[PDB]
Amino acid sequence: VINTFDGVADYLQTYHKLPDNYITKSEAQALGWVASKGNLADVAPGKSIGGDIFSNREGKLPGKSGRTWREADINYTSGFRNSDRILYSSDWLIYKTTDAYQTFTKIR
């Protein structure tokens, strides 16, 4: 149980898996997600959105003819997302943002 960037990295860099509380939008949506509400702590108490894939649809992440990028919410409790997000690359690269994907700074 954790929701910090380094915490997710340590946990993921050690177990090749996201913290025991990260669910993708895919499942969140099929689970019953609604824009005019943005539910989460209700259908998933003590959990956060993350695990999908970030097709670098922003040109703010390093690409390569053979690699993938994924995103995950950061600093969450009970309500909706925010501007803090962490980006983890298939090349073992850790990228973090704080204005909602607007800018981006590398941490590991």
What total number of domains does the chain contain?
Answer: 1
- The experimental method behind these coordinates is NMR
- C-alpha span between 29 and 31 (Å, rounded): 5
Q: Give the domain extent around 77.
A: 1-108
Q: Is 45 exposed, middle or buried (0-12, 13-18, 19+ CB in 10 A)?
A: exposed
- Report phi then psi at 29, rounded to 5: -60, -55
- C-alpha span between 100 and 57 (Å, rounded): 14
- CA-to-CA dists, residue 49 to 36, 52, 53, 62, angstroms: 17, 9, 12, 23
Helix (H, G, I), strand (E, B) or coil at 58: coil
When computed from its CA atoms, the radius of gyration of the chain, rounded to whole angstroms, is 13
CATH classification at residue 10: 3.10.450.30
